[PDB]
Design a protein around this ligand. Structure first.
Ligand code: C2E
Lengths: 158, 158
């Protein structure tokens, strides 16, 4: 019963699965700012470290990658899925850094950050373990979904 | 620690806090479908039971309450916060059923929901414990935030 497992499941059910389904079944028939894409990819970007504010790391990564704000109209949620994306030739490259990981940080930040300001090596190990388990569960869920296996990737670099 | 704790923290950081901040500091100067409200409330609706699809229960509850889709404009996220709401006199009543709980359900289904089809009383016990811990952690986070303490409530009835 790891919390990163539940976080990965919630992230997959509430975003990754719907985004992959939109890429596979709706994007080829949807015009995004004038263009019609035949191929799309969703890239999951992990934070370099689980810092105090994952939203700021996400904003910085999106601006440094030259992404623009777009949205996908889905039928499995009452409101569209907001994303950041860019064009690479004929491919629509969507990126996302999972903001749901925020809680994870605070959880670790409430168990190890004691009697000191920085991050002990034990906090770093527990953080890396939670990160790796999140990535493993997310990859297992992606592999069991045809659309996700088709168009979703977890980014490698740190 | 407990996955319900991390789920509550992520739900508070990614929605409840921002919605309360919008209600307190941005709603009195924003037109919601033509009207400008001076008082607003956010009501958190827990599912009666943690069923297979929390999005369907949420849609059903929203239709049974006569709610309509609106959106809040926030400066802490690159895209607006989508909500369901209604008008009660001069008060804007916002409702939300936390879809993030979905993962929790599935997690429980991988430790007890075996060798049977339904939900045993022991699995139901663990599910109720996770739900109660989620509600308690969320309430503790609400009480430590002035805006949330001002305008956020967890619904009573089952
Ligand atoms: N780029 C992008 N990512 C998405 C989107 N929808 C979900 N995600 C990601 O998937 C995670 C789980 O979403 P959730 O299950 O609906 O669980 C959500 C959801 O219950 C609530 N929440 C967040 N934003 C909203 C909102 O705008 N409206 C409502 N009614 N609830 C929200 O807080 C919980 C946590 O949200 P997050 O921490 O950000 O964590 C979210 C987020 O990282 C999207 O449209 N665009």
């Amino acid at each position: 019963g790891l919390p990163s497992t539940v976080i990965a499941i919630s992230y997959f059910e509430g975003f990754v699965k719907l985004a992959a389904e939109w890429i596979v079944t709706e994007m080829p028939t949807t015009e995004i700012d004038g263009k019609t894409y035949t191929s799309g990819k969703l890239y999951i970007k992990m934070p370099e470290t689980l810092d105090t504010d994952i939203k700021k790391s996400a904003m910085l990564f999106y601006k440094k990658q030259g992404l623009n704000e777009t949205q996908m109209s889905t039928n499995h949620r009452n409101y569209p899925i907001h994303i950041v994306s860019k064009e690479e030739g004929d491919t629509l490259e969507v990126y996302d850094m999972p903001t749901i990981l925020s809680g994870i940080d605070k959880a670790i930040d409430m168990y190890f950050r004691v009697g000191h300001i920085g991050k002990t090596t034990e906090q770093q190990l527990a953080e890396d373990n939670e990160m790796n388990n999140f990535k493993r569960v997310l990859q297992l869920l992606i592999n069991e979904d045809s659309f996700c296996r088709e168009c979703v990737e977890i980014l490698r670099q740190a």
